[PDB]
Amino acid sequence: PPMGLDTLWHMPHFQKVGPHLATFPTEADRQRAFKAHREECAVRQGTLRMGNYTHP
Amino acid sequence: MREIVHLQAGQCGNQIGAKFWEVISDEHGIDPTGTYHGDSDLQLERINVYYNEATGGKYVPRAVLVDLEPGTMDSVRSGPFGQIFRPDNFVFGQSGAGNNWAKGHYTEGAELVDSVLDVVRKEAESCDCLQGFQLTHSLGGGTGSGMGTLLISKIREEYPDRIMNTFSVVPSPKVSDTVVEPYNATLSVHQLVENTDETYCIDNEALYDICFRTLKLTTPTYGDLNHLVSATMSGVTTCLRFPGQLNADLRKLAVNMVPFPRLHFFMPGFAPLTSRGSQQYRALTVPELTQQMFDAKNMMAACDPRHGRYLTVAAVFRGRMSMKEVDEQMLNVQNKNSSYFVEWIPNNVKTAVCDIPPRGLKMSATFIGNSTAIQELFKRISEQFTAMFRRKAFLHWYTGEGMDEMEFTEAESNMNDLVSEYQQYQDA
Amino acid sequence: THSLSLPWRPSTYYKAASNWPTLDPYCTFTRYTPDD
Amino acid sequence: ATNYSANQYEKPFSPKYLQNWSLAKPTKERISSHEGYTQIIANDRGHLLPSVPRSKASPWGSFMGTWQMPLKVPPARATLTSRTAAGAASLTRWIQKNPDLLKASNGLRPEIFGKPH
Amino acid sequence: NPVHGLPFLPGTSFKDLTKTAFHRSQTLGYRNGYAVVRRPTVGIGGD
Amino acid sequence: PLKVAQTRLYQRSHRPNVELCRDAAQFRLASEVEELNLSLAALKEKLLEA
Amino acid sequence: PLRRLDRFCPLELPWGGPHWKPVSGIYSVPHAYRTENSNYGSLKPAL
Amino acid sequence: LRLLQRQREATDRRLSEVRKALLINQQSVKLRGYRPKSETISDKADSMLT
Amino acid sequence: QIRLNWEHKETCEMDWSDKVEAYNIDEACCRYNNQSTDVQFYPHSAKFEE
Amino acid sequence: KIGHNVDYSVVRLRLRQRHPQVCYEQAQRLVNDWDPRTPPR
Amino acid sequence: MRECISIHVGQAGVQIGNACWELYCLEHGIQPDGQMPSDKTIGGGDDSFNTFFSETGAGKHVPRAVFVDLEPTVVDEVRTGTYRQLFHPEQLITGKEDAANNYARGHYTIGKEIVDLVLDRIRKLADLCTGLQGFLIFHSFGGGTGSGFASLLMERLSVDYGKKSKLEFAIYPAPQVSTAVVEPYNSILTTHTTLEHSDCAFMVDNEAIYDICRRNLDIERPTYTNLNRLIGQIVSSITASLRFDGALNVDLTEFQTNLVPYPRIHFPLATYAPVISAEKAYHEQLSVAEITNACFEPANQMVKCDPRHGKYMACCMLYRGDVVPKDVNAAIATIKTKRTIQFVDWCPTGFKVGINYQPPTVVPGGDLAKVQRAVCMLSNTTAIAEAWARLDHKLDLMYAKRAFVHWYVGEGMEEGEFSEAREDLAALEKDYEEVGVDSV
Ligand SMILES: Nc1nc2c(ncn2[C@@H]2O[C@H](COP(=O)(O)OP(=O)(O)OP(=O)(O)O)[C@@H](O)[C@H]2O)c(=O)[nH]1
Numbered sequence A: 001p002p003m004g005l006d007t008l009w010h011m012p013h014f015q016k017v018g019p020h021l022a023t024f025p026t027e028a029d030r031q032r033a034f035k036a037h038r039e040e041c042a043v044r045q046g047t048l049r050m051g052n053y054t055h056p
Numbered sequence B: 001m002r003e004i005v006h007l008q009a010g011q012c013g014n015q016i017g018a019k020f021w022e023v024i025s026d027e028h029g030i031d032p033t034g035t036y037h038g039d040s041d042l043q044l045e046r047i048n049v050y051y052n053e054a055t056g057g058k059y060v061p062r063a064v065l066v067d068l069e070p071g072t073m074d075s076v077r078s079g080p081f082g083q084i085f086r087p088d089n090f091v092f093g094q095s096g097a098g099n100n101w102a103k104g105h106y107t108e109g110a111e112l113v114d115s116v117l118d119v120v121r122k123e124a125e126s127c128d129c130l131q132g133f134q135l136t137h138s139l140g141g142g143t144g145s146g147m148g149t150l151l152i153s154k155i156r157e158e159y160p161d162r163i164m165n166t167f168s169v170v171p172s173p174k175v176s177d178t179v180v181e182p183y184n185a186t187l188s189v190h191q192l193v194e195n196t197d198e199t200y201c202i203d204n205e206a207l208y209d210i211c212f213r214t215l216k217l218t219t220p221t222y223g224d225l226n227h228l229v230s231a232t233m234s235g236v237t238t239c240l241r242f243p244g245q246l247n248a249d250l251r252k253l254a255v256n257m258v259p260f261p262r263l264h265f266f267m268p269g270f271a272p273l274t275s276r277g278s279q280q281y282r283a284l285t286v287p288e289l290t291q292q293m294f295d296a297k298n299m300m301a302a303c304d305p306r307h308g309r310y311l312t313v314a315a316v317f318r319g320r321m322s323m324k325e326v327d328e329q330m331l332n333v334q335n336k337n338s339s340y341f342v343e344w345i346p347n348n349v350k351t352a353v354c355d356i357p358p359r360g361l362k363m364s365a366t367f368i369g370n371s372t373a374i375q376e377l378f379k380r381i382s383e384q385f386t387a388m389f390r391r392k393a394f395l396h397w398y399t400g401e402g403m404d405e406m407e408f409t410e411a412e413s414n415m416n417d418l419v420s421e422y423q424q425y426q427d428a
Numbered sequence C: 001t002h003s004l005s006l007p008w009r010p011s012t013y014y015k016a017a018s019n020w021p022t023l024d025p026y027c028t029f030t031r032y033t034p035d036d
Numbered sequence D: 001a002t003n004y005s006a007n008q009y010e011k012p013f014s015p016k017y018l019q020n021w022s023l024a025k026p027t028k029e030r031i032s033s034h035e036g037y038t039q040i041i042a043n044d045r046g047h048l049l050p051s052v053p054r055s056k057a058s059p060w061g062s063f064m065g066t067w068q069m070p071l072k073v074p075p076a077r078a079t080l081t082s083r084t085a086a087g088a089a090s091l092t093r094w095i096q097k098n099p100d101l102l103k104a105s106n107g108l109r110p111e112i113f114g115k116p117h
Numbered sequence E: 001n002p003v004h005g006l007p008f009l010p011g012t013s014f015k016d017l018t019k020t021a022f023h024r025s026q027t028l029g030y031r032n033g034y035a036v037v038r039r040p041t042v043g044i045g046g047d
Numbered sequence F: 001p002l003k004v005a006q007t008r009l010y011q012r013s014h015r016p017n018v019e020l021c022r023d024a025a026q027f028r029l030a031s032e033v034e035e036l037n038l039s040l041a042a043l044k045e046k047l048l049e050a
Numbered sequence G: 001p002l003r004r005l006d007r008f009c010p011l012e013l014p015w016g017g018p019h020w021k022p023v024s025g026i027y028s029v030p031h032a033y034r035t036e037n038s039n040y041g042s043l044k045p046a047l
Numbered sequence H: 001l002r003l004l005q006r007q008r009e010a011t012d013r014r015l016s017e018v019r020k021a022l023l024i025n026q027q028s029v030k031l032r033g034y035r036p037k038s039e040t041i042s043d044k045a046d047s048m049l050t
Numbered sequence I: 001q002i003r004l005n006w007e008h009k010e011t012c013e014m015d016w017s018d019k020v021e022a023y024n025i026d027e028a029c030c031r032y033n034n035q036s037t038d039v040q041f042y043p044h045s046a047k048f049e050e
Numbered sequence J: 001k002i003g004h005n006v007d008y009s010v011v012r013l014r015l016r017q018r019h020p021q022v023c024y025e026q027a028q029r030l031v032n033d034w035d036p037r038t039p040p041r
Numbered sequence K: 001m002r003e004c005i006s007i008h009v010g011q012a013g014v015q016i017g018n019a020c021w022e023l024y025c026l027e028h029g030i031q032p033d034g035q036m037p038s039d040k041t042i043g044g045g046d047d048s049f050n051t052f053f054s055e056t057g058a059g060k061h062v063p064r065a066v067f068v069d070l071e072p073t074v075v076d077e078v079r080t081g082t083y084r085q086l087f088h089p090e091q092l093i094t095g096k097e098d099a100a101n102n103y104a105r106g107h108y109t110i111g112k113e114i115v116d117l118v119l120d121r122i123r124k125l126a127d128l129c130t131g132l133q134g135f136l137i138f139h140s141f142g143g144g145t146g147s148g149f150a151s152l153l154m155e156r157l158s159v160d161y162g163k164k165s166k167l168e169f170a171i172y173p174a175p176q177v178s179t180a181v182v183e184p185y186n187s188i189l190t191t192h193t194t195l196e197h198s199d200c201a202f203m204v205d206n207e208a209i210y211d212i213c214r215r216n217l218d219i220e221r222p223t224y225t226n227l228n229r230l231i232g233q234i235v236s237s238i239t240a241s242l243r244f245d246g247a248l249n250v251d252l253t254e255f256q257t258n259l260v261p262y263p264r265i266h267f268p269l270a271t272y273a274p275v276i277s278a279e280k281a282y283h284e285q286l287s288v289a290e291i292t293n294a295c296f297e298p299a300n301q302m303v304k305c306d307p308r309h310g311k312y313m314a315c316c317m318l319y320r321g322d323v324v325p326k327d328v329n330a331a332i333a334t335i336k337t338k339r340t341i342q343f344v345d346w347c348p349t350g351f352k353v354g355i356n357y358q359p360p361t362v363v364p365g366g367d368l369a370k371v372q373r374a375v376c377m378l379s380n381t382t383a384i385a386e387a388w389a390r391l392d393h394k395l396d397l398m399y400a401k402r403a404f405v406h407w408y409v410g411e412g413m414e415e416g417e418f419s420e421a422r423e424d425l426a427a428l429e430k431d432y433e434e435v436g437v438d439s440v
């Protein structure tokens, strides 16, 4: 049985970099959006987990 | 004696005007060469409303064709009637708006408004007595929406007592022709609220619905869609150019249809639309005109009147009809539908009858209706706008043209206040 | 040719095929002027 | 030199209508009116007198060649809308990093617009 | 190809389909500094 | 237009040997002159009764 | 070898362009171009 | 045991059904707003939907 | 072989000369319009169709 | 009467679309008219 | 009045521009010698060539193009080819030694020599532009000239012209095939320097066009000309509004406003809908609904990125031929109901449309069928973050050991520019993440 694709290795050196474009009104809205997007990792297809819902 | 100066801005405005001037030319009997070949004296007695005299039995339109990039007026000029416009009336620049309201209002339209104002002054002060203005444009673009509102803002400063009509084309609910179109529509509406006396809102897919369900046209081109807008444009001013038993010009309608100054957004309609095989199934009669006229699938805006209450409704009839029948039918329409008409206005119907019908037709009528159900277009635009502006979607293309960030806040506040003002009269 | 005009005039084809004989067959304004 | 303005006919002589699509000089829209006559502030051969103040800019212009323009040139548009405050600060500091390119004759003309949060 | 003749109404316009060339022409251009408006000679497609 | 059709028919008659051809333009110009003759006949008769 | 069936259709329209002057039919409307005030000083008005 | 985790897709279907049930609750709440103004009052059914 | 090559080249070249003459005639025929001179009436000859 | 018909439609719709092998795209096409919500303030 | 200057840089740029200019000549009436075959009008004739061609006094049209390469063997084929008489001799610039798969040669040492000659030729070509709209730059992300010198061109053009529009036609690195080893280094460096000097950047892969040519077209074992003809068809459908009549005209300035939501995400993907062979076109009706649905097929995309792995942000649709706007309205209304096509909440519109009545032209020798309808869809999707992550990993594997950096550090480029280019795209990685989350 073939397993799913991995997340591709990067340096820890460039994992502490933040974003450059702030596209949310407040920081609380940012936290709420990211704390609502991080429950549906296992049910979203594609690497980095920003795709469809994988369906039945 | 009562002249109208016609303005067109942008692709939408130029393409609608190219059909409107052809329709007026057929109405008044003008060949493509510019001369007059009419067969009745009534087509020449009131030709000064839209035409200027020239030597040799030749007439020229009062049009001011405005575009930021002249790519549309090149195809306009190559048409069957494109050579009748005066060459000095074409005003153009080298760079287009790029579907940007800020560019066409501050960056590119500011360098082009002087020549347009010069042409407008030249064509407006040569008239015996100016009646008003007419502007055709769209709220989804950058030239017809950005500079098309700058033209209104500069015209209303100089001539603050003339009728300012805007036959605008407003955004559709289902499919968008421009991505940044809610921003353009919001800003152009904020300009249009405090600078116009009348505003006629036209939805493209309403015209597609008309051409599909009522006319059964499998392949309606944009010229077929523009024909209906031209026909409903020429019906409003048909009492200036032709006599009638009961006359009503633009000012009389502006008095009768606008109870409060901010409520001047109207929803048009054209009555005798019949398909290609069913002309034998219906007769040109006043009951069978008003049956189609008040219908929901006959309007030019995508909001049925059952969502609200009619405030004022007009119908400029054309032809030789008995106005007892007209009065009885427009009373029966109000009496049958009690809940869709306001209560504190005893009569919601203004009626005008003109003798001369369109050619080939016994009779016709042009619906104009001030309904509270216009608010759902505004609410759609406002929520599509605040979907983007909450996360600042395309704001970098506007502030980089010098704009201020409270512009969109101010425009949204004005639009929301207009919606609330419409909601005030929903429940008396 | 395609059609059959009733006064059939094949003479110029006959001359041209007499000179250049690889010309293909000719299989399928009624009077002349005195200059002709 | 000095680029004056044909007052009615400035539109034909605009920098973009003469088929010049690059950055151009700005024209003079107003002319000051002065009375009296001028003193003589130079001598023969064009030398300024010792009692007349001079300009600290170098003569022979301020022109940046290809091999003198800075590596990693700054932005031309540089709009700050919808940006991190630190990142927009970095972009602005990138604009202000090379003052010699900004004051060059063929220099950059940035449009610092917008405001980060 | 008979020519019939109809009244001009909002629902009567029969487009062509035997038309491939949709070339446009620069009848509105510029000059040294001036907006030239030259007379049209060809329509859409160079006809 | 009748002049233009007749001149187009005249100039093409002086083409060289092989390329004297029954192009569809020849049929088009014959139909041109026939249609213009019919139109002229209609206009002249109707002028007479006017 | 083709090069001609791409820029040009091998077809013609079966109809000519419909003109907008069926004048004997435009005047077939009852009381063609006759206003209401013409009845004042005439005989037998009806509509 | 890896083939024993073929019931991992079985709970994808159940999550789809839960999401569809949420959509149906949304549709049911939005249809109940079409009632007249006197009818639309606070009710135990609205609390049940919540 | 050289003589055969020259014969075929000259045959193709006479064909090309005829083609360029007919092209000039047809291109002159295309430059005709209602608002122009260089156009007259001609008698209806049988050589216009042959 | 109108309220009773509306609630009966809600019950019937909920019973229809609960039955499995219903996909999402036949479930969002039932009640689909765009009703914009009133102004923010 | 609608002139655009095409700037082809690199071997990919020159070989693309060959097919592009062949199709530009064939679409109008211009022979390979630069002359019209005849003057059929007495004094008229269409001036539609003014977008691409500049007419001299007598009869000759000269292209508004600059062909730049650092190796003579690619330009010299045009110089001694069929279109030799068409091109002005000074419009074909050529270096003596090439960049050889190195960004540093094209950016600091060798490419900084011919930059003045290209800038003066660009100024001379822009002098005859009456109504200039913007520049079109064709290059590749994997080469040395097309990555370094194109970036230097953007570098100079931002200084010399300001806010003038400059669209890209890049060749993105493929996810599994490549024709170089140091390709990730060039890709990271020339993305980092031109993250902001480009208004838009249309990219296509090469493996994806191989898959389309194998699957949609009937041909196997294709060459680079088959890809170049498709890219030329894309660039013709982009600029078709400037030369032909249109129900809805699409200016070149409209693309950046209707496709670039935020100041760094300007990388949309291109796709051409009815790319099918002749015998497949014989059995298929190609209505607006079919070719609108075929644009959103994952297999029909010209970049090797699955759209189902991300979220659509903006879509620009350009239509050509016998197209009714009613059917366009219906077809785009149908697509929004789909669940396999997902959009972002902050863009409820998501569509810009444009209809042109000119049908696409058939170049002889090409395998494409004569169609009455065509769509060139330019879609900006969040699903490209897979490609940036794979390029990130491929740069990462080599930069862990500092392989091949002696070729770059020894030629005027310091080591630190790797450390800030990688950091900037690592910022862009989560810049894509911030616009993909929904607000609740
Ligand atoms: N689509 C397409 N891509 C090409 C073509 N030729 C080269 N490429 C791409 O270009 C990349 C390499 O750059 P080249 O164009 O060959 O050469 P260059 O860009 O001038 O760089 P240098 O050779 O170092 O000067 C390869 O990865 C190819 O994918 C072509 O004809 N068509």
Ligand SMILES: Nc1nc2c(ncn2[C@@H]2O[C@H](COP(=O)(O)OP(=O)(O)O)[C@@H](O)[C@H]2O)c(=O)[nH]1
Residues within 6 Å of the ligand: B009, B010, B011, B012, B013, B015, B016, B097, B098, B099, B100, B138, B140, B141, B142, B143, B144, B145, B169, B177, B178, B203, B204, B207, B222, B223, B225, B226, K247
């Ligand atoms: N309804 C209708 N809309 C049109 C027509 N022509 C253009 N438009 C609309 O115009 C909008 C585009 O704006 P446009 O005028 O082209 O931009 P501008 O030229 O910069 O002002 C689109 O939403 C179209 O729906 C037409 O003939 N009918």
Ligand SMILES: [Mg+2]
Residues within 6 Å of the ligand: K010, K011, K071, K098, K100, K143, K145
């Ligand atoms: Mg190379």
